């Protein structure tokens, strides 16, 4: 009768509230875990394949050409298009270091937005993992208060009447704890996987920015060196 | 009844299940302890040996040769090859400052990647040590509510009737905490060790960068003062 | 006992209830203001995403509501250029501009987090004052049961009752305290990311227009004139 599942039958004014709250918490943390895990696993497989495909880049144009046939929601191609439109806006601007700083800040804001998107439910995971034991204790002490007012309003030394109230209180407590522990363990594993994913996206961002810098500096070195050192000291 | 080893039946089936879970968690944490400790001591000896080798490193070819004769499966040789191939790729260029910038960026990226690859199981130990007291108190409250509902369905007045379930809760808490303590101990220990390892690899990376700056300044300043000022400043 | 046992109990009880109502009203006010600011910055970012030079951005920002850090920073960078006032150190100009923008956005984010530590300490200390109430009540109950030595414990009930009542008040003040504290941390992190985005945008605009203006004026004026007159 008074099993772990047999509570909606023997619920009370505060007991039903804490029960529905904790079952809602468990359901939402379970679905968050499943959905975010599947989505991030598929996304990470796709990103690994894309990084493997682009791990042999030689120039900006070649990288863009090889990544054109990637997925539409490709963060790699997102960064490539970001650098390309940055160069387009920086057309007729002979300030390499400025373009490098702008591109670096742009990739930084992009990876920050990506971390915010991925790290979007982790805040709620931490909140629920912290509060579920506390709301369990709240329901427990409310049940204790109900039992105490029942004892004070009905003074009887019956040993059996004191059992069900405390039993339901500790059962709500255990429900709070069994909602808490999965919450925090999933928060931790999600923190680990998002750390790995952010390291990977930082790596690919470093790759694209270093390729940009390399090709731009090579072109600049060649052209500037030849023209300046061949023309403007005999032209004076 | 003889000891904790002989009280594996009078508890709940889920209690025994989570108890075996705690035992296997302790076993796998000790296994990770042994494995990661052996690996980290091997890496520490390798780092100290490589540092003693590069104690007088003042030439890129000399550093590469003195590091290749040791175990080539070392992060030191990885960083040396990285800097060498980066200079080879970005050769015949006059981005010396940008050379240093991009080189240091790639070095710090690879150092962060390797450090992440080193400190992997530390997160697992942290999660285990965090959840073990929580699952212990969860088993505790489950056992105590089972005892209370058993006393409710029955009618017991003696004081020795609450002994079995409460004792099972005690042993569950004991298992949880003997899993928790070494978890956080090894967590902080490995944190200190990976901090020292990061310090040492940063030292060797700064040494590579220092040697690179040294040789590049040697190749640039002399050639500029002997040729760049004499090339076309005389024909002006 | 001594008639001064429940005075501290009711004192800490009303303290927790006032702390909870303060958390509720600061939730109301801060949520309203932060959602208004979020919508405002979203609209103004959507409007300014179509900017090319500082002139169009300034002429569009002058039409917005001046209660926005965006236009403040825009006019601040304009005034900083005007203070530069014919100084050809564009790099130092950009560096000082970025430093001022960073200091301003940091100060604004700091001003945003008003009740953060407030709710933090409230939720941290409410369980402790609950424990204090419980231990004092059970101490007075022990004193009473020692003054009247008996096995019947029908007199301890009101003491432990009000003790756990104060404890439950501490819990019902701390749980909303901590959850609203975390919600506020998340929303201020989002707002900080947004203002950092708009600051990077305005700094990129400034640098881009400055380099655009300097490129031709440097490759046409100083180059030819002096390298033929030197």
């Amino acid at each position: 009768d008074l099993s772990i599942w047999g509570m909606y039958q023997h619920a009370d004014a505060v007991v039903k509230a804490v029960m529905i709250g904790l079952v809602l918490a468990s359901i939402v943390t379970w679905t968050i875990l499943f959905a975010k895990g599947s989505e991030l696993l598929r996304a990470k497989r796709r990103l690994r394949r894309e990084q493997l495909a682009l791990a042999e880049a030689r120039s900006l144009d070649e990288a863009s050409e090889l990544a054109q046939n990637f997925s539409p929601e490709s963060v790699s191609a997102v960064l490539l298009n970001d650098a390309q439109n940055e160069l387009e806006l920086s057309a007729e601007s002979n300030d390499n270091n400025g373009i490098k700083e702008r591109t670096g800040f742009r990739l930084e804001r992009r990876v920050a937005a990506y971390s915010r998107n991925m790290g979007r439910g982790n805040g709620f995971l931490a909140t629920i993992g912290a509060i579920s034991p506390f709301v369990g204790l709240f329901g427990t002490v409310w049940g204790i208060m109900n039992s105490f007012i029942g004892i004070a309003h009905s003074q009887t030394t019956n040993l059996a009447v004191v059992a069900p109230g405390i039993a339901e209180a500790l059962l709500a407590t255990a429900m709070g704890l069994v909602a808490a522990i999965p919450a925090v363990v999933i928060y931790n594993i999600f923190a680990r996987v998002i750390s790995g994913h952010r390291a990977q996206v930082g790596d690919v961002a470093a790759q694209v920015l270093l390729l940009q810098g390399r090709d731009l500096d090579l072109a600049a070195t060649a052209e500037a060196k030849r023209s300046q050192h061949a023309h403007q000291l005999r032209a004076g | 009844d003889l000891s904790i080893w002989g009280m594996y039946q009078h508890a709940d089936a889920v209690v025994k299940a989570v108890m075996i879970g705690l035992v296997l968690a302790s076993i796998v944490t000790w296994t990770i302890l042994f494995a990661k400790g052996s690996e980290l001591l091997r890496a520490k000896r390798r780092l100290r040996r490589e540092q003693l080798a590069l104690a007088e490193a003042r030439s890129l070819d000399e550093a590469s040769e003195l590091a290749q004769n040791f175990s080539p499966e070392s992060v030191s040789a990885v960083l040396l090859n990285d800097a060498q191939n980066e200079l080879e790729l970005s050769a015949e260029s006059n981005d010396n400052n940008g050379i240093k910038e991009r080189t240091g960026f790639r070095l710090e990226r690879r150092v962060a990647a390797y450090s992440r690859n080193m400190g992997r199981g530390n997160g697992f130990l942290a999660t285990i040590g965090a959840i073990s007291p929580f699952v212990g108190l969860f088993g505790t409250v489950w056992g105590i509510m089972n005892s209370f509902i058993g006393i409710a369905h029955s009618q017991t007045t003696n004081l020795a009737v609450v002994a079995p379930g409460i004792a099972e809760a005690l042993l569950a808490t004991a298992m949880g905490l003997v899993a928790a303590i070494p978890a956080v101990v090894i967590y902080n220990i490995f944190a200190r060790v990976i901090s020292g390892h990061r310090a040492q690899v940063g030292d060797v990376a700064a040494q590579v960068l220092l040697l690179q700056g040294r040789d590049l300044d040697l190749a640039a300043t002399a050639e500029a003062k002997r040729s760049q000022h004499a090339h076309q400043l005389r024909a002006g | 006992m001594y008639q001064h046992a429940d005075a501290v109990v009711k004192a800490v009880m009303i303290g927790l209830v006032l702390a909870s109502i303060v958390t509720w009203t600061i939730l109301f006010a801060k949520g309203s203001e932060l959602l208004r600011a979020k919508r405002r910055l979203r609209r103004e970012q959507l409007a300014l995403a179509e900017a090319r030079s500082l002139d169009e951005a300034s002429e569009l920002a002058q039409n917005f509501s001046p209660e926005s850090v965006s236009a403040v920073l825009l006019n601040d960078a304009q005034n900083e250029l005007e203070l530069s006032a014919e100084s050809n150190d564009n790099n130092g100009i950009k560096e000082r501009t970025g430093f001022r923008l960073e200091r301003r956005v940091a100060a604004y984010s700091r001003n945003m987090g008003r009740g953060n530590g407030f709710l933090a300490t409230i939720g941290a200390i409410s369980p402790f004052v609950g424990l204090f109430g419980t231990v004092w009540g059970i101490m007075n109950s022990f004193i009473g049961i020692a003054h009247s030595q008996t096995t019947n414990l029908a007199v301890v009930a009101p003491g432990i009752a009000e003790a756990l009542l104060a404890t439950a008040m501490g819990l019902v003040a701390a749980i909303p305290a901590v959850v609203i504290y975390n919600i506020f941390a998340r929303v201020i992190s989002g707002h900080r990311a947004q203002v950092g985005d708009v600051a990077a945008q305005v700094l990129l605009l400034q640098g881009r227009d400055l380099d655009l203006a300097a490129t031709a004026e440097a490759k046409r004026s100083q180059h030819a004139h002096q390298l033929r007159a030197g």
Binding site: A130, P133, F134, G136, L137, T140, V141, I144, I151, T157, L159, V162, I166, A169, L170, T173, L177, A180 | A130, P133, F134, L137, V141, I144, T157 | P127, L131, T134, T151, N152, L153, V156, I160, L164, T167
Partner: peptide
Amino acid sequence: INVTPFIDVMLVLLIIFMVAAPL
């Protein structure tokens, strides 16, 4: 971290045991 919730459960255990002490 959050090994605090033993307080209320242990104290209510104390209370129920001390009130069941007579019968």
